[PDB]
Paper text:
To provide a comparative context, we also examined wild-type [name] in two states: without any nucleotide ([name]-Apo) and incubated with 5 mM ADP ([name]:ADP).
The [name] is a AAA+ protein found in prokaryotes, archaea, and eukaryotic organelles. [name] is involved in cellular protein homeostasis by degrading damaged or misfolded abnormal proteins, which prevents these unwanted protein species from forming toxic aggregates. [name] is known to form a homohexamer; each protomer is composed of multiple domains, including an N-terminal substrate-binding globular domain (NGD), a long-helix domain (LH), a three-helix bundle (3H), a AAA+ ATPase module, and a protease domain. We show here, using cryo-electron microscopy (cryo-EM), that the activation process of the [name] AAA+ protease may involve a pentameric assembly and a substrate-dependent incorporation of the sixth protomer to form the substrate-pore-loop contacts seen in the translocating state.
Author numbering:
A (entry chain A), B (entry chain B): 243 to 774
C (entry chain C): 477 to 635
Write the structure that this text describes.
């Protein structure tokens, strides 16, 4: 109203395109009118201000040193040392990540892994090395283009989408932006946000992306995007373009202990301001890993170590008497209350029909159990979790296997006409291709129908054939890592997954007991205590 | 005239950062426009006033010892059992982290608890401990970021958000800002104010928190924020980093009586100007708490004892009869009318099919009167109460268990496909969204389909799994507090939680009589009044 | 009422009056008030039957506001029928000549004459504009079995 004349000068002082200037002129002749009593004038001035608020004509340094990135991803993060090779061979070779634009294979370098892993920390580290401003943005709960693109501006209360809004929070026009929680954009509310990402997906088409608040193709030419794929089950098929998948698996107990001892506990002590007045034994950290965090990464362990540090700080505020205290495993419960988990599952006191499996979850590899009961009925079958049909088909295959071998393991002669079965699975959706732990359900059905107990110390995963074969499956290494974190030793694995076994770290191949199998009956006889 | 000179003197006396001072002086130089017309020299005057009365570089003495906070929590507060420690821990952390290491650190004590139980009193005592100012900010009905951030400062009719008002009323820049009821926000009208909370509420972004009525972002790098929500299942996920919860559970009736005698009833006596003129016997106090209030926390006691004080004021003021009155449990209805709630739950004459379990509702822990109609039909379980399939899944698991124990409880030989079931659960989707009261619905179904009275005054809480084992349930404190709210002495708890149970304070222990269980076959032994 | 304005509030509930209380308040203060309001000073007599007729046939709002309006109408028609001549020293209005001074009775005397209907029930509620019935009605069509709320009420009524 009063500064508009100055606003008239403020437009072209900072470099803006000329179509933007044309639409600003179209929205500019509408001035010289009262604002109050006219919300259209208010939203018009909001648009005029936004024409300047959005970033224009800035830059970031072009440093892409191979050795700098190597050191930044090496010394800061004691973990990795293997995926760092992959990101090196990708980026150091990749002069087409940005700066150079061609119509060829330029993948957006998706990051896949459980929430606990430091893929986001990898984003922080690579952004620090590249010296391009970092900003994540949440995408879960977003299913609308109007929630990602601008809100159509016709009345007061219109704002651009969180993409442009986030790019306003930074002071550059060529950033590297992590897209946190990019797993839940479903085309069910006002179009497909996947299409908005698709125009963004290309390194040159995003330069033509037009908002809805603003109506000009915005400049996305030298902007890199990296996406956090927390889910390891399914990917958006339209987003298949320009993919080279980068996956972060689970962590070994050795690696978790080392990372806790070297670059997480020191910073946790630092956040409390201590100079090292608290020390923790290695066995204490082992107990914290085992009996306090049943996760796939170090996210929960960070919180637990913070709890320990805060308890130590409060105890030290009771008086100045500590040159240094070492917190061994003896007094751990005095800082974290009751131990929240078992040291291992050797005290399970084997159940009857219950089995244990390795399921595919958005938190990556995870140990889970499957429960089945033989209730009288008409041989019907019930499931849990509104399951994907992959596990339903696995259950049907298990039933077919157990119908032809009723007399091989003392199963009832007709259990498909007189006894119904209720089956529970903690993870129901299973967008992962095929049943992740179908053989676990097969074992559970066999144990439940056998009217015999079943050992609970042994995890397994894979699929069953209609002929009783133990099918191969991907991600076996992650499930082995998850079982190792819980300490489950005897792991049953398909004979077809020897390739997955070779790449396992030597910290895994020693403390477990692998069991290569190709028939369901073998797995049945290696867990069921009595055969008849 | 002299008004501009006075404003110049005021802006000279008041200090602020250099950019703010320079731009305020420039907009002061931008005066002399039409005062008695459209806002061009008046909104500028309002801007200058806003910049002059919002405080800059004004603070309070801070905490330098946990001993003073120890005393302020011991006296003028009943102690609050396990929450004696957590606040002291956090304050120790804050005291030790005063060497300017709070940025991107120092979480803010989200205080989850029912409105009745002392939360704002905790904040008031804490503020008194450090000698800080106090000011609440109600955010239970906020839907606009402009109610938090400002608004475009170009016209008259738009004021800054609640935060700027609260900073203005407080004479210093680092008060104890208590954000009321933050969880119950919504995003229905324009925008989403969740990002406003994210920016204001995190250090290293509070100084980055932007204002809109004042174009200059204001710095909250010193405010000891504290936030009291009621539900952890509704706060936005981004508002969980640096958000450590200090949970405040309900109260036992013994604690209610002990605090009524000390802080509540004497406050009412001082309120109605009846100092040392009327007494109340502890029998009357326990009658009041057990018959007139059925809420977690002691806010109801405030109203009830205020009513008693007012009635005493009227009865005295129509003529004194002695110097110190008295009252017992036999004449409470003379002062509060009909006792709304039964003094004891042993006189409930157990009903036919309905069971009653425990739940931690956000308003306060209470009992779900889970009702079951075993209407004859074709066999189906329709579950009302605005609930997801998690309640339906717990229902199906319990139904499976009873199907495994048909003849063990007089149940029909087949009832999954013979009698339809209606299961009304009054909003079981409360915090801990999902089945945390599966055994309650299990015994409800057992009573309903066995035509045997589900014993009342035994309020249970637990989980039923497909096999039948009663697995542990999180939060074995809120459940017991809700158990003792309704004056229930008999409680059924999973055995796997007894290790947690031993950690509970003696106030919740002695007043309750726990009969630990590990199966459903033993739960149906307690609450079935007859043997069959 | 706003929650910020609900603290430090003590509620003093004043629901509507009762029919005999309505007669009593009309006889004690309302009727003399309106009689001196119009300009009449004691030459009109009104029987209690006429008062009850006014109350139960021309007012359904809780209280006396509608009664105030109806009694003002009575006073103004009395201004008619005394202004053109003092025919009588104290004119008496019974239940018979109440529509000569007012409109047609717009409400029934008693609800007992409702002649019970096949498929309707008479509810109760306190709508914050005044108490009222909830004449909830339902229907039974031969179909396949399904419930349909109608009236834009909450799902609790469907429950
Ligand atoms: N592979 C890894 N190597 C080193 N550190 C890791 C690794 N994975 C996780 N971390 C640690 O986990 C912590 C949390 O990182 P991050 O997940 O990026 O933060 P946020 O949880 O806020 O996204 C970091 O401090 C990082 O040191
Ligand atoms: N130990 C205590 N526990 C609960 N309430 C208390 C305690 N001590 C005092 N009170 C009183 O209970 C009232 C309710 O406190 P609180 O719940 O914090 O505020 P609000 O009810 O406004 O949320 C306070 O006014 C306080 O005077």
């Amino acid at each position: 109203l009063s500064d508009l004349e100055a606003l008239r000068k403020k437009i072209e002082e900072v470099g803006m395109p000329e179509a933007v200037k044309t639409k600003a002129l179209k929205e500019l002749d509408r001035l010289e009118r009262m604002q109050q009593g006219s919300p259209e004038a208010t939203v018009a001035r909001t648009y005029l201000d936004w024409l300047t608020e959005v970033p224009w004509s800035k830059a970031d340094p072009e440093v892409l040193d191979i050795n700098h990135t190597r050191q930044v991803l090496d010394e800061d993060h004691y973990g990795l040392k293997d995926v760092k090779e992959r990101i090196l061979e990708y980026l150091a070779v990749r002069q087409l990540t940005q700066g150079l634009d061609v119509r060829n294979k330029a993948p957006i370098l998706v990051l896949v892994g459980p929430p606990g892993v430091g893929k986001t920390s990898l984003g922080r580290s690579i952004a620090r090395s590249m010296n391009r401003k970092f900003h994540r943005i949440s995408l879960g709960g977003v299913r609308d283009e109007a929630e990602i693109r601008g809100h159509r501006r016709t009345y007061i209360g219109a704002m651009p989408g969180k993409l442009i809004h986030a790019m306003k929070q930074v002071g550059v026009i060529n950033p590297v932006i992590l897209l946190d929680e990019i797993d839940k954009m479903s085309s069910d509310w006002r179009g497909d946000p996947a299409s908005a990402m698709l125009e963004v997906l290309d390194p040159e088409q995003n330069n033509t992306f037009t908002d809805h608040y603003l109506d000009v193709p915005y400049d996305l030419s030298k902007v890199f995007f990296i996406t956090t794929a927390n889910t390891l089950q399914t990917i958006p098929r339209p987003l298949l373009d320009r993919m080279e998948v980068i996956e972060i698996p689970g962590y070994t107990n050795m690696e978790k202990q080392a990372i806790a001892r070297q670059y997480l506990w020191p910073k946790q002590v630092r956040e409390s301001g201590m100079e090292g007045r608290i020390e923790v034994t290695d066995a204490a950290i082992l107990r914290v890993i085992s009996e306090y965090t049943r996760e796939a990464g170090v996210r929960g362990l960070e919180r637990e170590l913070g709890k320990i540090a805060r308890k130590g700080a409060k105890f030290w505020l009771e008086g100045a008497w500590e040159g240094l205290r070492t917190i061994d495993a003896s007094d751990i419960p005095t800082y974290l209350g009751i131990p929240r988990y078992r040291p291992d599952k050797a005290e399970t006191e084997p159940q009857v029909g219950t089995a244990q499996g390795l399921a595919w979850t958005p938190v990556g590899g995870t140990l889970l159990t499957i429960e089945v009961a033989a209730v009288p009925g008409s041989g019907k079958l019930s499931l849990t979790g509104q399951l994907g049909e992959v596990m339903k088909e696995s259950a049907q295959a298990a039933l077919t296997y157990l119908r032809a071998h009723t007399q091989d393991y003392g199963l009832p002669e007709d259990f498909y006409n007189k006894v119904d079965l209720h089956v529970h699975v903690p993870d129901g959706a299973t967008p992962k291709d095929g049943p992740s732990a179908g053989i676990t359900m097969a074992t559970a059905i066999a144990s439940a129908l056998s009217r015999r107990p079943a050992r609970m110390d042994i995890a397994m995963t894979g699929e069953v054939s209609l002929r009783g074969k133990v099918m191969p499956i991907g991600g076996v290494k992650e499930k082995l890592l998850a079982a190792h974190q819980a300490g489950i030793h005897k792991i049953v694995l398909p004979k077809d997954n020897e390739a997955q076994l070779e790449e396992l770290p030597k910290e895994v191949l020693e403390g477990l007991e692998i069991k290569l199998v190709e028939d369901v009956g073998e797995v049945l006889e290696y867990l069921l205590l009595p055969e008849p």
